Amino acid sequence: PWWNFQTEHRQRCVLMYGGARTKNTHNANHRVFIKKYKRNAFPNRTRHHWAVSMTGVLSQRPRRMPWPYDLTSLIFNQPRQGSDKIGYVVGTSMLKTAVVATNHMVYYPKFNQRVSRTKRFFAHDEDLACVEGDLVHIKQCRKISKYKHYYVFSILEPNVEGRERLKLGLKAVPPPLFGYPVSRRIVKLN
Amino acid sequence: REAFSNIIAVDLEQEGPMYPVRVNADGVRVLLYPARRIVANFRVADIL
């Protein structure tokens, strides 16, 4: 009985009246980190592990938990979570495939506040309507290819500027000026 | 005589504070709150 003191205990086999039957897991173990590597040479390029690493997911402090309540569930009644998503079309390099960036929500109960994260999806548009920078509605469906479970259900907002831009033979959107960041210094002149 | 100069009194109609008092003496932050009984450090307790 977890509500009884150290000295008050008689039998360890049963709860006499009611309450919760509780196993004590020993939380304070003084667990330690073993140091197997020199501070100079650690066998990873991007990150180094010098201390005890916190583990689990949802057991992870500060807790970050799935938030069903956001814009997407606000507008839709979803049969299954993530069955509907609203997003923007980012890039079409693949035939009958629209990549879509979408936002979802995370809740930190410690600070009592929400964050928006973002995630990319492959959606299947047969007939190739979607131009980069469309606002689209997207649904869960039959497995189509290795990574496509989603199809374009409706175009909410098409890109009129982008379409007229295509009609003239130009790319839908200008290609981004710089790519991913580097740790080098590129000296390229003229 | 310095203690009799500073004498305070308390209205006991209510027998204990009815709201929290949050107040600091020099560098010492004190909380005086309503309780079911008297709970405090031994010294603070027989002061109260």
């Binding site: 173990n29 003084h30 667990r31 330690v32 073993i34 | -």
Partner: protein, 87 residues
């Protein structure tokens, strides 16, 4: 609480060690004398570590392994571990 002094207990309350050397060291002023320091060895995950600890114990007939416990601070700077009994 100072948690880095316990480095060689490795999350344990007591340790088992083997005797190697016993030398003497002089404490931080204004404390004069000779503090007896035993230089001990033990192994963990097939690594052999040399532990250095304060000898407060009672030695009888010749014996080898001791039991190490961590304390508070002592006169002698740099020696964290203390001796419980000798086996």
């Amino acid at each position: 609480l100072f948690f880095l002094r316990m480095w060689f207990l490795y999350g344990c309350c007591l340790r088992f060690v083997l005797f190697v050397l016993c030398y003497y060291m002089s404490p931080r002023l204004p404390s004069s004398g000779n503090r007896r320091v035993l230089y001990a060895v033990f192994y963990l995950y097939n690594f052999v570590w040399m532990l250095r600890c304060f000898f407060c114990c009672f030695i009888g007939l010749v014996m080898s392994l001791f039991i190490i416990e961590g304390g508070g601070f002592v006169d002698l700077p740099g020696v964290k571990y203390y001796t419980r009994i000798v086996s």
